[PDB]
Amino acid sequence: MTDKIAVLLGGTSAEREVSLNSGAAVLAGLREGGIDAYPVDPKEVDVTQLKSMGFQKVFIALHGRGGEDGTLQGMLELMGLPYTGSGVMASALSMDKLRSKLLWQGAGLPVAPWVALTRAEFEKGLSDKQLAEISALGLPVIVKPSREGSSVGMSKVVAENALQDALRLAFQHDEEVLIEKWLSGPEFTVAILGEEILPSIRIQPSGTFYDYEAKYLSDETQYFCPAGLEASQEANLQALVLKAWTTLGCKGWGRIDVMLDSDGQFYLLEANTSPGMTSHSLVPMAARQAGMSFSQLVVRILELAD
Numbered sequence: 001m002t003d004k005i006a007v008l009l010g011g012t013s014a015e016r017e018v019s020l021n022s023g024a025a026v027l028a029g030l031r032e033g034g035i036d037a038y039p040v041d042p043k044e045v046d047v048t049q050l051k052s053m054g055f056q057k058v059f060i061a062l063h064g065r066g067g068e069d070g071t072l073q074g075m076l077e078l079m080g081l082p083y084t085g086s087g088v089m090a091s092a093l094s095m096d097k098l099r100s101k102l103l104w105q106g107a108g109l110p111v112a113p114w115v116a117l118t119r120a121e122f123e124k125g126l127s128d129k130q131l132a133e134i135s136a137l138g139l140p141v142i143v144k145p146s147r148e149g150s151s152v153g154m155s156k157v158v159a160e161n162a163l164q165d166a167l168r169l170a171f172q173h174d175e176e177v178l179i180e181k182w183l184s185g186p187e188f189t190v191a192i193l194g195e196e197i198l199p200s201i202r203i204q205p206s207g208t209f210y211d212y213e214a215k216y217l218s219d220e221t222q223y224f225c226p227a228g229l230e231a232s233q234e235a236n237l238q239a240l241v242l243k244a245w246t247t248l249g250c251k252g253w254g255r256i257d258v259m260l261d262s263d264g265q266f267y268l269l270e271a272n273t274s275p276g277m278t279s280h281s282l283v284p285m286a287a288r289q290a291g292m293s294f295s296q297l298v299v300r301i302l303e304l305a306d
């Protein structure tokens, strides 16, 4: 009441349906929690008059460019309205798998070997000497859109001959793409809440990689929380997650995907400043384990709104 909360759902990313699913759930969650929440789809309502509508706070239940980079946040900040996660810089940093990577590697964080390509270097004919780059990475390699979420445009390329196409795709989603070494080890994600870190979740997709279908439309996907990892490696995780996180400048709430390599080490894949909150999403899982309910999480997330 008075404190009319706005849950920004959908928008126009490639993640819009997931977004809409998050919003619907956070909307419920905030309402069970006793907050006057509102479905504000930026794909209709001009989020600029958000100030004019009487909202006192905003819940970013949006995923991707338009909603997860520093764009909206910049607005909100100038409007004078608090929002739920990572500031302007940590939102723009996180959304760039390419820049998030150089900063992490910059600070000596365990980042996977990559090779960036732009679309312009792409429609030219990458040096038959730029493959020297890419093939010194090994086989396979996973090619991905720089600024995407929910495993969009990603394509595993086993063999140099399967790359050109892996790239056409990734490229239909961005002009800067990262080609990286395939990590042969379990897949992990850690969730941050305030300055706390929820129990670790080990994902086990029944496919090749935690693809789009695996993340949302699949029941084969196995979820282990915590990781059932030894208290050594477990300590190494949080440690690394928080490092890679403060290095980014992120706050309030977020989630980091890491995976193991044949080397025994942890490799930061990427970071998320507006994580999913669907009936399949990871944050929600991390929290229930930490004995919280969906309205406690979503509500605690708002308590952090700045």
Ligand SMILES: Nc1ncnc2c1ncn2[C@@H]1O[C@H](COP(=O)(O)OP(=O)(O)O)[C@@H](O)[C@H]1O
Binding pocket: 097, 112, 142, 148, 149, 150, 151, 152, 154, 180, 181, 182, 183, 184, 187, 209, 210, 211, 257, 259, 269, 270
């Ligand atoms: N280096 C890698 N080796 C193997 N699989 C990888 C690698 N990087 C990412 N993947 C797979 O791709 C998925 C999406 O990777 P991620 O970088 O988190 O992108 P997104 O923004 O789509 O969430 C990961 O959950 C993992 O399943």
Ligand SMILES: CC[C@@H](O[P@@](=O)(OP(=O)(O)O)[C@@H](C)N)C(=O)O
Binding pocket: 015, 018, 063, 148, 149, 150, 151, 215, 216, 255, 257, 272, 274, 275, 276, 277, 278, 280, 281, 282, 283
């Ligand atoms: C199940 C995967 C996860 O999705 P995201 O938060 O992370 P991701 O980019 O690695 O997929 C997603 C909504 N961007 C989620 O909803 O829990």
Ligand SMILES: [Mg+2]
Binding pocket: 094, 095, 096, 149, 270, 271, 272, 273
């Ligand atoms: Mg991101």
Ligand SMILES: [Mg+2]
Binding pocket: 148, 149, 150, 151, 270, 271, 272
């Ligand atoms: Mg992502």
Ligand SMILES: [Mg+2]
Binding pocket: 150, 151, 257, 269, 270
């Ligand atoms: Mg991921």
